[PDB]
Amino acid sequence: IVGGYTCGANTVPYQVSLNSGYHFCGGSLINSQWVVSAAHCYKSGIQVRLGEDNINVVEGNEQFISASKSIVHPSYNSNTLNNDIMLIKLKSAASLNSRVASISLPTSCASAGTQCLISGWGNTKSSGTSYPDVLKCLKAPILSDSSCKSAYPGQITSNMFCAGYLEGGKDSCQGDSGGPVVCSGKLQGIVSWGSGCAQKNKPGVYTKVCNYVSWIKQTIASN
Ligand SMILES: N=C(N)c1ccc(/C=N/O[C@H]2CCCCO2)cc1
Numbered sequence: 001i002v003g004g005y006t007c008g009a010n011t012v013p014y015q016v017s018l019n020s021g022y023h024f025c026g027g028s029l030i031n032s033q034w035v036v037s038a039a040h041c042y043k044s045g046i047q048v049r050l051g052e053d054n055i056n057v058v059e060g061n062e063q064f065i066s067a068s069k070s071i072v073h074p075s076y077n078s079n080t081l082n083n084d085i086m087l088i089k090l091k092s093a094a095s096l097n098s099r100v101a102s103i104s105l106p107t108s109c110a111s112a113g114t115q116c117l118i119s120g121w122g123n124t125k126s127s128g129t130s131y132p133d134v135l136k137c138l139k140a141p142i143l144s145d146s147s148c149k150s151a152y153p154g155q156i157t158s159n160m161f162c163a164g165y166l167e168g169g170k171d172s173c174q175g176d177s178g179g180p181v182v183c184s185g186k187l188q189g190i191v192s193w194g195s196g197c198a199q200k201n202k203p204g205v206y207t208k209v210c211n212y213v214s215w216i217k218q219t220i221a222s223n
């Protein structure tokens, strides 16, 4: 997260870190045994880390649970990033409390102008590279589909939305991938892609979660 703020320990209780020896992606806990992330975060040997603030220090509220299976969206295209969504099942159910909690799925799509909270442990610099240890947060508005398409001609599908600031300076970044965009207590987006980070006229692009609720529910129901 570039141009954001320190969230505060366990203030984003649905935020997970995906770990394969090191943090490599975010995710969102949607019930005691399932996490939603980006398909471009797919790899084998994922351990899900819940209740994290400083990802480099055991602070007392962590739950580390290995994934039993991952399901990449049936229509994910890694070239265009269309359908950039993946479900991860935990080997055992997380113990849910105030600091480790699920986030609700949307019942309808959010509109341009809706203010959302974007979070993660990704790069904090728009030019260089600096990775934070503690969770970073950014409040950002959903942008109009027209401005999104104008920013990225030929690249925005109906399964994507832009959020952020066309002036630049405030954005998600590398390492935030797969993490949440939460608007009025609903998971509306997943950190997906962008041209660099926090660049002028290049806002963040996010997977449009409301399009996938049917798939998420039915997948969970049978797995
Ligand atoms: N500007 C953004 N909001 C932005 C930019 C980039 C990303 C993530 N990229 O993932 C890279 C790094 C490694 C995995 C695949 O390739 C997210 C948001």
Ligand SMILES: [Ca+2]
Pocket: 052, 053, 054, 055, 056, 057, 058, 059, 062
């Ligand atoms: Ca920790």
